């Protein structure tokens, strides 16, 4: 997980790390959450407006 | 803070979720009356629900 984080550039949260039991699961998570935001910066999650569409 | 009505405390004692009291009319002038009839007034009596609230307010720590 540390290696994955280092290569990625991004931080996978502690809870997520605890949950995900396989490399495949980790990959799937990454594809879901970080990837789309990385692709499109307007699509990214903002803190002050968490319920944005 | 609130305090107990001492006269009321003297008159009334606790009995679970009610108060018990002595009967009125058995301190003098008893002669002439029937003794059996008088025996009704010798014991104690539970508080009537009409004045239960009043009693509670008088005796906050009971």
């Amino acid at each position: 997980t540390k290696f994955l984080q280092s290569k990625s550039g991004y931080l996978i949260p502690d809870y997520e790390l605890t949950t995900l039991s396989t490399p495949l699961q980790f990959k799937r998570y990454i594809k879901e959450k970080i990837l789309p935001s990385a692709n499109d910066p307007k699509l990214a999650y903002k803190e002050a407006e968490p319920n944005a569409i | 803070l609130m305090k107990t009505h001492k006269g009321t405390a003297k008159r009334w004692r606790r009995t679970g979720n009610t108060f018990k009291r002595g009967i009125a009319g058995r301190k003098h002038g008893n002669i002439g009356w029937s003794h059996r009839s008088l025996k009704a007034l010798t014991g104690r009596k539970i508080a009537h629900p009409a004045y239960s609230k009043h009693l509670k307010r008088l005796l906050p720590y009971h």
Binding site: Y15, T18, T19, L20, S21 | -
Partner: protein, 106 residues
């Protein structure tokens, strides 16, 4: 004794997101003194008796359904599961029966 144990002794199944505890399963933790958390409660000025069941982890609906299956004699209607605190209220003083049902597993 130690609050956080070492990394070696902790197994994988002990961690969160393992063994599938969320999906349609539950637990009912005993009290500090070591008794089943099932209590009589006398609401509305002693007029409304109800049996409360506390300390439920996981799916409460499933647990309720299981209890109903165990105790068919209690009606279906009288099983109010409050979701905010996760506790399941029953109408009668049905404490002892509930305890009996739970004891075997919890």
């Amino acid at each position: 004794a130690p609050i956080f144990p070492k990394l070696e002794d902790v197994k994988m199944h002990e961690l969160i997101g393992n063994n599938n505890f969320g999906k349609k399963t539950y637990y009912v933790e005993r009290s500090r003194t070591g008794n089943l958390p099932v209590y009589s409660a006398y609401k509305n000025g002693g007029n409304k008796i109800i049996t409360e069941i506390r300390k439920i982890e996981g799916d409460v609906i499933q647990l309720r359904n299981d209890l109903q299956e165990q105790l068919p004699f209690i009606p279906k209607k009288s099983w109010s599961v409050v979701m905010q605190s996760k506790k399941i209220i029953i109408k009668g003083n049905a404490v002892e029966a509930v305890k009996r049902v739970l004891t075997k597993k919890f």
